[PDB]
Amino acid sequence: VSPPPPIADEPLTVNTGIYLIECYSLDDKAETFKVNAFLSLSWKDRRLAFDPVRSGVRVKTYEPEAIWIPEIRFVNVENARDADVVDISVSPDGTVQYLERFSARVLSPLDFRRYPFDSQTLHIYLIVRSVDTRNIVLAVDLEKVGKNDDVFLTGWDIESFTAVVKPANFALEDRLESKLDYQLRISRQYFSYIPNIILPMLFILFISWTAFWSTSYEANVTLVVSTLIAHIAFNILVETNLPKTPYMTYTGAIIFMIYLFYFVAVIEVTVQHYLKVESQPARAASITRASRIAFPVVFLLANIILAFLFF
Amino acid sequence: VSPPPPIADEPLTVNTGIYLIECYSLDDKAETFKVNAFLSLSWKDRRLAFDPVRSGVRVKTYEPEAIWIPEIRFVNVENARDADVVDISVSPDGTVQYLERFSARVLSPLDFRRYPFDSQTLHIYLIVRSVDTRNIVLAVDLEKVGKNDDVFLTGWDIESFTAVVKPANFALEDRLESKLDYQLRISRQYFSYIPNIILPMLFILFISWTAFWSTSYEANVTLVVSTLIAHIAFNILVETNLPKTPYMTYTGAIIFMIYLFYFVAVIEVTVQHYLKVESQPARAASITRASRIAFPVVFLLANIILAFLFF
Amino acid sequence: VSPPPPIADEPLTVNTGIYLIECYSLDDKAETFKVNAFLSLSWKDRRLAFDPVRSGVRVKTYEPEAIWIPEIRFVNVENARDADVVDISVSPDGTVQYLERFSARVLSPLDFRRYPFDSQTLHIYLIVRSVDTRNIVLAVDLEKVGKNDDVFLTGWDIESFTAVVKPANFALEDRLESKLDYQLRISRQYFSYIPNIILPMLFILFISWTAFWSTSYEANVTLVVSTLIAHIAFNILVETNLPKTPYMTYTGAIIFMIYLFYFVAVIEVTVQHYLKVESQPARAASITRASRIAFPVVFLLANIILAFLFF
Amino acid sequence: VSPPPPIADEPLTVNTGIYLIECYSLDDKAETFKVNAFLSLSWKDRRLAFDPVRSGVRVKTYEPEAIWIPEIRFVNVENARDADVVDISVSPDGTVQYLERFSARVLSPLDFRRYPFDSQTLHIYLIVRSVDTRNIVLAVDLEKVGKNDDVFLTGWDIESFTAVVKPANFALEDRLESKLDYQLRISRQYFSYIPNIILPMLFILFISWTAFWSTSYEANVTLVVSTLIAHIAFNILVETNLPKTPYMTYTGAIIFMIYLFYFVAVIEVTVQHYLKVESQPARAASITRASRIAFPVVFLLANIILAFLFF
Amino acid sequence: VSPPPPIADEPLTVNTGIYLIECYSLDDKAETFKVNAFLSLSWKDRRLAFDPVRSGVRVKTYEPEAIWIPEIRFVNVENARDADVVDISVSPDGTVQYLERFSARVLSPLDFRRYPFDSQTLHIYLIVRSVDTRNIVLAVDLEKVGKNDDVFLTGWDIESFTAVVKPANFALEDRLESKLDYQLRISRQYFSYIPNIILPMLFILFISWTAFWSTSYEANVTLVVSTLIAHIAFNILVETNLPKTPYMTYTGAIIFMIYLFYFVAVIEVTVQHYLKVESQPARAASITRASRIAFPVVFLLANIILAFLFF
Ligand SMILES: [Cl-]
Ligand SMILES: [Cl-]
Ligand SMILES: [Cl-]
Ligand SMILES: [Cl-]
Ligand SMILES: [Cl-]
Ligand code: NA
Ligand code: NA
Ligand code: NA
Ligand code: NA
Ligand code: NA
Ligand code: NA
């Protein structure tokens, strides 16, 4: 089998569509997601044309091996898609209608800057390479692009699944290549981060601030050091669910800043004890009273600054 | 091979059945389960009809390649099922009896709202896409739906395995689609959660309340902060066995609430010490005595409210 | 190819044997084990009979496709076995000798009640489904059941590998099915649990009891709470190596009971401090002295009771 | 099919190229990375030459089975590459242009000496084994070596992808072998290590040094021991992301050195308390005051020495 | 295809060789390692004799399916090897030279008694089962046994790769089996265990001994209990990298012994406090002073005894 010959010198247009059946395993660390979908393909092959009257059939079914089928690949996949051909239908003018159901693990970079209040644009890049006989170009049949209502991505809200209609045509290894960009827009369900990470992290921090109403150095050291350790545990927990980024994430920024608050609270607790030992408690009392206001105030203002820089 | 032609204009009815052999790996985080089962298919193919008197044979056995077989797929699977054809039998009237043994990983969302006292309805969706020649519709042969007595799903009780007899017939990409819903009803074995998570978590909380019978600030800080850290460990343990949900789970609610109790206990311990230092212990004594009753009482009432909202 | 036809109306007897080459990956959480073995099959196919004199051979070697072979399956496997046919030999009277080497992941429930001093009976269920033409029954050739001397299952002692000679014959979807039960009896190597989990857990508990020779509330709180946290770590460690069971395991029972001892030790430490503050130390001394005997005594008796209930 | 015969006695030159499409999963512990790329092959097969004016076709497209193709393998792969042939083009003179898209898991040792400020040279070794008929030698077509602009390796910066043009030709098992070295130069994005590991580790160390402004032994013991435990947690965290090396890494060296600082701080805290108990506080004061300067100074100088030895 | 016929009554000798290309993933817990190697096979099949004059060629190249190939298997593999035939060369007398490149996961028990200062002998067992026509025996072609210079096993030093030239010929299920033992001698790179586990574990132990220069019970309890918890963390860390053994490992013995030292240190700290409270500090001072010498001395002697028993 060889590609359909051109009537003049036109390129062969392969109309494409992706209909999402399943979306699962969005792995943040790996920056991958798994997809199960219908891939539809359509092109004209004159050599397969027939007369409906003398045939007695309005449509003709073929096995993939019997006819020429464009070698369509995905750019951003780990391994080649697992595909099973569903149907191949030919109309009288030789218009081929191809349908396969496939599953693939897609590599798509994620921007963690606003995590866990982030939104992403996942990409599925469709590609075809041209042959010596003719140049093969991809198009989007919008009537064949969509997603099942039951499509759920655990921990995310699916906003839209659209295709950029104009392909990116370019040369690669002395042949032209036609690339389509299918975009799946998603937004993270931040809900669970609030009772599981955010609030627990704030509670332990506020507990360290009770040291500003205590003159007991031994108790103060216990309050600040114990909560710091619990903060380290949350830092470790958070970083294990995320990849290493060459930039600061919103959560990473807050987590890092909270260390500074623990560090300054230890300085305050130290200074307070030092003055008490030096028989200067009136002074220590002035520093401690100021700290009661300064710590929550600087914490609120630093958070307003951070939220501003990130959102 | 082509589909059996209609005598009139009727759709082809494919009778189905699923007999569960094995159920394993119910993964809460992934919202998946693995299944090993018999899939039975039955349809009439008049082209295969024969005479039983002259053939001397009551049944004819065919190899899958020799005859037309409907392309039946599962909707909610990760990858296409791993199937091995067991038997194909044709009766004299041309009724085909197909049997395969398959294994598949099924995506089925779980409702964690009542965790670990939750029940689930797992779904296995069977599907067939109509061909151009004719419309294919699915039916349930209840005589061929069931499960082996030895079917066990570790950590769960299997209640029932039934099929919704009426298929969901709908158009998808300009063809008809016929979908059947096989339902596996299960209830979680909550037993182990009691000695492993629930009771240990209650013991550490009750240990924090011994601070209400102590005037030692240093010891109190140690009691409340140490148990809080142990509570954090249980929170982390629990959340690692669960996916992130856009709702509160029953266990999540209790775990979150317990932080408030630790926070208020720290306030009490702080207020008590502050008054003692200010030479007001009679007052501190009134707050501490009230706390001895208030803490267990508010804990019980808050739990009654939560159990009511969730069950 | 079709099954051997019956001389009268007898079922076809397929003689079986399993010879274990490798046993590995006994996963307690998954309740699975991996096996690599020889599967031997033997049956009479008269159509294959020959005269040794005429042919000039005592045996005939065929390829699997050339002759009829029974469709033998394993019941309790994750996926169908990975098999490679080793040999097919036909004797003059049509006695077929089939040999394959296979590997499979077996699902076999485990009874954790006596963990880590438990013994198990792993099962490998062999099955055959009858055909329209012939009822197929399985038998055990004891001469072909065994295991290699080098067969080792890490963390277990292999006791015996035997087959229940009488198959379990039953109807499944209007066809006879013949099931054989191959049993691999194993006993857990409990050795390592002693220095790694049991003794460390006892040491920290005994360390909490040193609080009965101390009047220092602050030191007592540190002793009991710190060791309780270390006990929580062991509880978590143990539960990660085990599945969730709807029953108490021996280790689970001891681990749970030890929490009660920590809880009562905190009550004692609290009561002691309370009396000391109330200027009643003579009393506190009576409770503390009683506790020094009561705690180890009640611990020993409770352990005797538990060992009795479990063994 | 057999290899193209030599006109004289020359070896067959197979021109190669690798064009990277995807780079993912650089696993530090495993010392592996996954690759998805185009592999291009070119050689002269005179038996395939044709007339351009007579044939009318400028290029002939063959199926892999139809012609002889060199058996090209990767040396440093876990399993054989997953490959799909894209195109085979023959020019009139018999110059074959072969193109496949492959995916593979590559074993490439990493030098962790300067971690997390390390750079690596990943290798992909291409190999061909000669046949009895003739010797096969590999060459690099630089025009067909490259990488897609979108190629991203999470946590790394990609510097260059080049090939050492001269193959390593050697005898192995009495036949010639021709090996090419494709080099992917990368540098680690150390950014995230600063707020996640480095700074938190420095903060806890500096917190241990507040004990030099405290006379409270009980508080000092709490400060030094608590922070030491947090240092152990960071040591464990770091070592889990790295393989075991027969050399010290930069981070490993700093982490190890910090233990010595904790050990000496405990000695200081002990010596200070001992002198205070012996009624020699003036002296303890001399040691403590010296420690305030000595600890940060020795820490800075030791770090300058270490950075010098490693960079 | 059938086996080559015997000229007399001799068994068919299949000469073997294994040339290691890659060694990776030595998993201590699983007691497995992955291998990528050349497997060479050589046997005489006179039925394949040819005249170079008539056929033109000096050596014939065959496809595996075209000729008889001995069914060679590995005994100690998880699954059957992934093999790719590189060449099948037949010389005029009928001597076949078979070459394949394979990858396999090998089960080979490890002796952890001296861990992490242990050495191992990994085995790769090659096997052939005899057929009816004739008995097959394996031999080692030493000229075809070896390893690539670049063969590295992360965390190990490779000493030698040799074959026991004499096969183990034995009866199995009424047929002969011929087994060869390929041995890969390795020694563990213990380096990293010193700064990561050994020294940190010794530092925390020595820190607990500072309690022998302190009269502060509250500080002593903190020193001994905190370092004990850090010791538990190292115990858990070590045991996660190792399988459960029915014997004591060297590291396991040291780790276990260190618990006894913590237990006795708690007794000492308790006894000291008890005497101080009873107004007997002179006695307490005698016990504490003795402990300063006894603890490091008994620790050194116990380690000399342990090293002697293990090495
Ligand atoms: Cl693809
Ligand atoms: Cl399916
Ligand atoms: Cl099977
Ligand atoms: Cl390869
Ligand atoms: Cl093998
Ligand atoms: Na085609
Ligand atoms: Na068919
Ligand atoms: Na057959
Ligand atoms: Na070829
Ligand atoms: Na303390
Ligand atoms: Na063969």
Side-chain angles (χ1 to χ4, degrees), chain A residues 215 217-218 269-281 284, chain D residues 213-216 276 292:
Chain A
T215 42
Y217 182 52
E218 303 69 29
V269 156
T270 307
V271 167
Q272 177 201 46
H273 176 68
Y274 191 87
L275 296 169
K276 174 147 264 72
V277 168
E278 245 189 4
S279 286
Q280 272 168 254
Chain D
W213 281 269
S214 164
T215 41
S216 177
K276 174 147 264 72
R292 299 169 183 177

Side-chain angles (χ1 to χ4, degrees), chain B residues 69-120:
Chain B
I69 295 163
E71 284 175 10
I72 309 292
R73 292 176 302 277
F74 287 105
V75 177
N76 61 322
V77 283
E78 298 234 323
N79 285 69
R81 76 191 182 263
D82 171 34
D84 281 325
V85 176
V86 170
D87 197 37
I88 297 163
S89 276
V90 175
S91 67
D93 71 298
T95 292
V96 190
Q97 287 233 255
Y98 172 99
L99 187 69
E100 66 163 63
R101 198 176 153 182
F102 72 88
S103 61
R105 195 185 172 190
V106 188
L107 237 320
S108 180
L110 311 165
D111 186 359
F112 297 93
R113 263 159 278 248
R114 295 180 178 195
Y115 178 96
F117 309 97
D118 59 296
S119 281
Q120 307 293 334

